[PDB]
Design a protein around this ligand. Structure first.
Ligand SMILES: *[C@@H]1O[C@H](CO)[C@@H](O[C@@H]2O[C@H](CO)[C@@H](O)[C@H](O)[C@H]2NC(C)=O)[C@H](O)[C@H]1NC(C)=O
Ligand SMILES: *[C@@H]1O[C@H](CO)[C@@H](O[C@@H]2O[C@H](CO)[C@@H](O)[C@H](O)[C@H]2NC(C)=O)[C@H](O)[C@H]1NC(C)=O
Ligand SMILES: *[C@@H]1O[C@H](CO)[C@@H](O[C@@H]2O[C@H](CO)[C@@H](O)[C@H](O)[C@H]2NC(C)=O)[C@H](O)[C@H]1NC(C)=O
Ligand SMILES: *[C@@H]1O[C@H](CO)[C@@H](O)[C@H](O)[C@H]1NC(C)=O
Ligand SMILES: *[C@@H]1O[C@H](CO)[C@@H](O)[C@H](O)[C@H]1NC(C)=O
Ligand SMILES: *[C@@H]1O[C@H](CO)[C@@H](O)[C@H](O)[C@H]1NC(C)=O
Lengths: 495, 72, 495, 495, 72, 72
């Protein structure tokens, strides 16, 4: 369940090389996999915790100045200096002013003057990092089989919750009758911290490309402040104005929090003060099957009074899924059920729940079915054939190939290399393909990284054109290079 | 500052929307307009220097749009 | 007298125009000048008291370190820090060190590490700017008036020393029996001051140019003083030793003293101790006659008998001097001096002290004369002849013709165009000639300073080569531009 | 231990030529290395303590001048001279001043006047020296893997400390169980002493070479002066000056401590408070592997129960080094170690701590291996699987390969010539190479010395071009010269 | 002086940082260059005669850059 | 350090004698020579780069002198 009506999703028919599935999940998604035997499963990856973070650096959004002063000497004769300048906890500047004669000096012409200001930070913000070893994930997989817990329940026992930390590797999935999943996460090459900079603001935080968070302007600390205030800089903020030439003074300015956010814009949202748990995983792994029997198995096929409890709407695709009602045989009673085609048998089913199974005799329970393209009959087929429903999709197999083409592609650019992890067990094609993409990706289409939206599509064109009208053969490759790739990115980038 | 060099180009794009997916990203061009309308002239100047500079037509067009966007 | 046997020395002939003569004064030198009538005078510079200047800068030569604390921070985990980095009066430094499970870390690779040493000194540079508000020159002048007192007697009231502060002007020199000689002296064009940097150094001193001064490394202070201990550029001393990897500690970086000295090598030394007597330089002044007297006109002619204590010298071109204990009557009057070709008369040589006058009975005075080339016949007396003296002066024709040529050139070398201010007066060809070589020179054989024998004279030899094989005319001016010009100026600069 | 987290150090797999392996050990570097057997070895040349040196140049840097007696004569007759011009310890110079009725004596003209002073000193260097008989090298080689007693902390016993030395050479070291390691080092031709001079300053000291340290300036002195003060120079130092014309006196050039500190810059340091401990200095050594059992090659393969007790971490390239704790029964059991691939044991576990053997159980051992360029799985269990975690390198082999080359230069230089001696008997290659590189290396490793960082590079520039033009493509001989030579050498030395 | 031609080139270049090295190794060129712009006059002229003497693309180049250094 | 800056250039001058006189006046070059003696290799080297480099006879001479000099 909780794998119906989510959009971020995909079906994985197969198990290859025996219990050998390859899957990737992007925090906000449901991963569904089918297999001739074993109740296909639903994988929801949620809370991805982290503990023991390094607060390296510490900028401040607000600033303030105190006990400011300033002085001069007289043209040339000395480059004026003030005592308190000693405590580098201030901020100062040497400037020139035509401090002449009557001014109260000596030999007019032009002189020096410095202003001092005891600095004071106000409402810093600070970042923080994490040792991969401490990225406590939470993956929760579960089996269907109707239930009141229906589709989408934020409570009950649902395939349990296997909290996984690379501080280990292979974990068991104890499932009531349903078996025991063997999951092997790849908590390391997933998101990729210690490359990331977990920073906050104030009850709102952000994950950020390291090499940036360690260069974006502002007056900083060190991640050892522990009573210091020797903000390397103090200069990025607070500025000195020299109106005309005299009363050369200093000033504080405004608490960047504003622009901060408004520059942190292109960056992903996150967590922090809620215990801290930076969402948005992009984690992959192997779903090891082997043990995953189909429960309730050893039971007849209980016949009798059947009813329905809802109609039949669908998102994902043919995700038509209907609940029923029952009275006939208490205890785990398998429920007859099919996917026939308009009267004339020659069924064409896509039953997606490895046989339902009634139970509580009072519990309505439901079912998950992927009917065909056009017309179709799902049939409860019980006693006198009791009930047959005809629904009707629209799933023209071709419109299918297309929306699929894209859909995958979308998941292509968003996972890069890793994307190929949906292709559980390759060899030659899918395997080498993953390979080629690896390098072809990391470089070139990722050798000019840092590029930007506009520019992106812009180069998409300028480049296609240096292509379009070229000179024999080669251009084909030039264009492609343009095609989708840059292009499709430019229109399908900016997360 | 907290004005420029945001978090664009990095490369941590995800499955979920970021901090200002549509809004800001579109706002950029939104403002080039703001400006480019405000003060025609540079449009003028540009496309002109354009006209005589380069001459490959696509050339002209290119530094025209280009130059224009560069001018804050 | 005074300018008598004191090397250097310049003899000038001028009353011209009807009132003045353009003359210079180079301390260790002296210009004896006169012309028609007047007690012919000996002018000499001597002492330049510069008063109550200011202290621009203040470096240090003796630098020591203390408290030296240091701390680090494991790989990544932020740039390492320590409070003490607050007290500006400390040298801090961030560095990297290979860290492992050994030093109790976590990652290894290389963490950060920093050092902190309070900074202090002994024996400071302490430059100084003077300000021509008071750059008082001291001038000593005087007549010859024989007198067995002597001719070098730097004691007593032999000419009386005098003051000259641009504070005011016109120096009206009172001078016994003569009157009052007047001088216009421009202390405001000599040592292009407040362009210079009078420097001190523990007890040593040196007139050192501004910019050179304001570039010399070493740590430096304000010129404000009181609390010093806030020297910048401490990076001239105290060094951070990072042997191979692990560990990194500091070192004072030795004293500086003598280094400093020899670092100098160009500045002209100077006694700056006793309220500083700033020797060296060249005061230029216009000299106006009249209101003078020789105390001889209206002073009889004195008759016969002359003892002659000592012989006859010459030195600087036959400027012979002689001492004669006159006898005859009393109450001194004139003494008839003469010089003609052996036997046959023709007063062939120029006398140089148109007042050979006796003072009292006993005081074997002295007169100075310039017997010409040849073995001129000197004589002194009246009727019974009383005296003749064979005196043969070598070369003296063309030999001295060129000799003085050089003398003069060198004058031009040191003190440039300002030297035309030694000719006499307005002249025309002269005055403007000066205003020509003036900028001309200011912009070629000079307008490219920062060299030496080697580099400079070498530049010559080459400007020559090229300046020797280029078709047409131009070449020529280029050739002389070099040789004797680029060159001579060269071989002489640096004395 | 001793070689985990020390960076920049090299390793050698396999010995060859029957225990006959070639090693070059430094101070910063260390050698990890092992054969197809024998417990790996950490090789660090540590204390290189010298014992008996002598003095041959007791240089001075702060001498005061006293007494000062100056005599004079008169033009021609006798070039002045005071006896003191013979009490060696006094300095003196023949000068000339003016000399006329004015000096108050002579008979006009410029002439003789010479002066002298007592040259007593203070600060003094002490350039000792040592024959290749008085320099003991202590080598710390340690038996990899074992206990959680840190893969570091120099302190405490871990691998012994053999004391090889030119007194003898080629020695053995008793390494508990495993065996007796026996190296055949050869101080003989490493350091290249006697060309070196141990110069102690105010306490610091630099080993700078003789063939210059002798040609250095200042006041000379032999070796055991003491009550000698028969200083051979002084002239260098102190200068009694005479300006513009007359008179003069003696002055000191000033303490040069500093300058010199800033002098020998560019010649390695060396502590100097307890006898001596002259660091740095590559030492060439033979390595005998024979008597060396890997210890416990006769055991069982644990049972299972390995709760790790330390993350893992990838260190200074390669050295991934885990720490595991095993509770159980077995006792003294070999660790079941495998660095495999994703499941399908294609296993490629280059563990480099051969036969890592659990000692007395209750003791968290640890080991170090070199996982591939991508992501490999790691495991150490057995029975019910026990343990397996996940890993990922970063760069990609080829990257490392280039870095193999980085060494290539940062090795083929520095420890030049001997650079070759870094490999274990390869005959043909290594052999002829050295025989040549020692030669052609000697040329531009002879004539082209003492030249500054920059200057060398320039030679590069002008050369690479002068080659470039080419008359019968021999220029390649030229470029190859520039290439990774003139350039590299230059662009990488001085430090 | 112990302030001129000091155990710099020689050799014995030990694979472990030296002394005032580094900081200095660069400070030097930095020193002159500064001077250079302190007196462009000399540069200007030199530059010229260089432009003249010998000359041949990089040729002229060399004479110059070299002399430039030459002067302190 | 302090060491590399001969106050000459400015040339405040005098008819007198500056601090360091002939001593430095010649040392400069003499020391250069001492050094030459030290690495005669490099002289042969420099002259080489010369004799071979460009040549107008002068050229050679010129650059030769320089290099040999320049070596700090
Ligand atoms: C979410 O799951 C919970 C778990 O059962 C469902 O809550 C039950 O709702 C029924 C009907 O109101 C109550 O009688 C039970 O007592 C509830 N169980 C408890 C204790 O939570 C809930 O219906 C589900 N919500 C949906 C529709 O997702
Ligand atoms: C310098 O001039 C002074 C006059 O002020 C001379 O001093 C007198 O010299 C005479 C004869 O030598 C003595 O009899 C007197 O006793 C001295 N009186 C004074 C002024 O002290 C002095 O001899 C001259 N000597 C020089 C330096 O030329
Ligand atoms: C360096 O070696 C020493 C042993 O020579 C280790 O220190 C020991 O630590 C244990 C732990 O409690 C003590 O019981 C011993 O008494 C210590 N030995 C002494 C006195 O030095 C040390 O741990 C090693 N380095 C590291 C960081 O492990
Ligand atoms: C700074 O100035 C404030 C005035 O608002 C004063 O109260 C405070 O004592 C001063 N602090 C010092 C000691 O500089
Ligand atoms: C510095 O160290 C000294 C001891 O050398 C100590 O007396 C002093 O309190 C410390 N604080 C300072 C002045 O840095
Ligand atoms: C010379 O020197 C000594 C000591 O340096 C000093 O007492 C005096 O000036 C002279 N000695 C004697 C009296 O000969």
């Amino acid at each position: 369940m909780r794998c119906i009506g989510i959009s971020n999703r995909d079906f994985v028919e197969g198990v290859s090389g025996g219990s050998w599935v390859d899957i990737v999940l992007e925090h906000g998604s449901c991963v569904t996999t089918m297999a001739k035997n074993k109740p296909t499963l639903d994988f929801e990856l949620i809370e991805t915790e982290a503990k023991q973070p390094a607060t390296l650096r510490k900028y401040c959004i607000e600033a303030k100045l105190t006990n400011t002063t300033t002085d001069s000497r007289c043209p040339t004769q000395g480059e004026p200096s003030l005592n308190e300048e000693q405590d580098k906890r201030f901020v100062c500047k040497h400037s020139m002013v035509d401090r002449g004669w009557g001014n109260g000096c000596g030999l007019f012409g032009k002189g020096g003057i410095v202003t001092c200001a005891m600095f004071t930070c106000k409402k810093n913000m600070k970042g923080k990092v994490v040792q991969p070893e401490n990225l406590e994930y939470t993956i929760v997989i579960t089996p269907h089989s109707g239930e009141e817990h229906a589709v989408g329940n934020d409570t009950g026992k649902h395939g349990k919750e296997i909290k996984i930390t690379p501080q280990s590797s292979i974990t068991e999935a104890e499932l009531t009758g349903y078996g025991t999943v063997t999951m092997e996460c790849s908590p390391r090459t997933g998101l990729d911290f210690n490359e990331m900079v977990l920073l906050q603001m104030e009850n709102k935080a952000w994950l950020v490309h390291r090499q940036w968070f360690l260069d974006l302007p502002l007056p900083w600390l060190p991640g050892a402040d522990t009573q210091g205030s020797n903000w390397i800089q103090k200069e990025t903020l607070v500025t000195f104005k020299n109106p005309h030439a005299k009363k050369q003074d200093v000033v504080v300015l405004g608490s960047q929090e504003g622009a901060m956010h408004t520059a942190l814009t292109g960056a992903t949202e996150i967590q922090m003060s809620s215990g801290n748990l930076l969402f948005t995983g992009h984690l992959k792994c192997r779903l090891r099957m082997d043990k995953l029997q189909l429960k309730g198995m050893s039971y007849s096929m209980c016949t009798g009074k059947f009813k329905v409890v809802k109609e039949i709407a669908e998102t994902q695709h043919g995700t038509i899924v209907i609940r029923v009602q029952y009275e006939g045989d208490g205890s785990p009673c398998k429920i007859p059920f099919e996917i026939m085609d308009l009267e004339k048998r020659h069924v064409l089913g896509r039953l997606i729940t490895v046989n339902p199974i009634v139970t509580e005799k009072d519990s309505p329970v439901n079912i998950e079915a992927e009917p065909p393209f056009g017309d179709s009959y799902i049939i409860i087929g019980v006693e006198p054939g009791q009930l047959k429903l005809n629904w009707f999709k629209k799933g023209s197999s071709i419109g299918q190939m297309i929306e699929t083409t894209m859909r995958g592609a979308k998941r292509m650019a968003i996972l890069g290399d890793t994307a190929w992890d949906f292709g559980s067990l390759g060899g030659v094609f899918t395997s080498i393909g993953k390979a080629l993409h690896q390098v072809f990706g990391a470089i070139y289409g990722a050798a000019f990284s840092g590029v930007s939206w506009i520019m992106k599509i812009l180069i998409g064109v300028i480049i296609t054109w240096i292509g379009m009208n070229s000179r024999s053969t080669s251009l084909s490759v030039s264009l492609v290079l343009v095609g989708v790739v840059t292009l499709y990115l430019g229109v399908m980038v900016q997360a | 500052s907290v004005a420029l060099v945001p978090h664009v180009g990095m490369g941590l794009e995800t499955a979920t929307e970021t901090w200002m997916s549509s809004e800001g990203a579109w706002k950029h061009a939104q403002r080039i307009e703001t400006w480019i309308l405000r003060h025609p002239g540079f449009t003028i100047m540009a496309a002109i220097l354009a006209y005589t500079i380069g001459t490959t037509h696509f050339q002209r067009a290119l530094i025209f749009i280009l130059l224009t966007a560069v001018a804050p």
